[PDB]
Design a protein around this ligand. Structure first.
Ligand SMILES: [Cl-]
Ligand SMILES: [Cl-]
Ligand SMILES: [Cl-]
Ligand SMILES: [Cl-]
Length: 193
């Protein structure tokens, strides 16, 4: 069961269009599709909502922390509602997947993502939460990652990411209603088959 879906972000209009906000794009779409608009809730350091997904009560969070303090919002909300790490799905931009691809993951490393690193920390050094990895591709120069994730994608890459986010939203209904195997069998086939 998933009780909390988190879309990682930096705050402000300055970052709303940047690759590092890709997880928030996903959560914004869930909010739109379930007619549950995200609104500031300062005790959880973010924007929150609540949706019915496949007959299950699921809370939404897009932090208003800087990305490196995402764990403060996720822990405050998870602790308040007595939600355990394994009941959290964290959506984030993923350098290791191309634009147009998304995958689910349970546990594993942060892939150098400053928001995942802070969540692992603030959940009690527990990496065993679900992730939605939204592919953004990688810069050619591994030195220039910050400039890349804090950049706006070109329109052709934005359209691919929007398509992957749309598919991941559709697969989230399946994840809640029929489980992680079924949701993964669909999502990981999206550009693979
Ligand atoms: Cl950052
Ligand atoms: Cl990762
Ligand atoms: Cl790219
Ligand atoms: Cl850079």
């Amino acid at each position: 069961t998933i009780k909390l879906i988190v879309g990682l972000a930096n705050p402000g209009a300055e970052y709303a269009a940047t690759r590092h906000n890709a997880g928030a794009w996903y959560v914004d779409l869930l909010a739109d599709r379930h007619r549950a608009p995200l609104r500031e809730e300062s005790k959880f350091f973010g924007y929150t909502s609540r949706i019915n997904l496949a007959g299950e009560d699921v809370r939404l969070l897009v932090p208003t922390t800087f990305m490196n303090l995402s764990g403060k919002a996720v822990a405050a909300m998870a602790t308040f509602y007595r939600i355990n790490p394994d009941e959290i799905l964290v959506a984030h931009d993923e350098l290791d997947l191309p634009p147009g691809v998304a995958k689910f993951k349970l546990g594993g490393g942060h892939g150098g993502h400053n928001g995942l690193k802070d969540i692992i920390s603030k959940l009690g050094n527990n990496p065993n939460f679900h992730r939605l990895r939204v592919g953004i591709g990688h810069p050619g120069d591994k030195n220039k990652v910050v400039g890349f994730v804090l950049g706006k994608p070109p329109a052709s890459e934005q359209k691919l990411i929007d398509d992957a986010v749309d598919e991941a939203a559709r697969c989230t209904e399946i994840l809640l209603k029929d489980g992680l195997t079924k949701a993964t069998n669909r999502l990981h086939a999206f550009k693979a088959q």
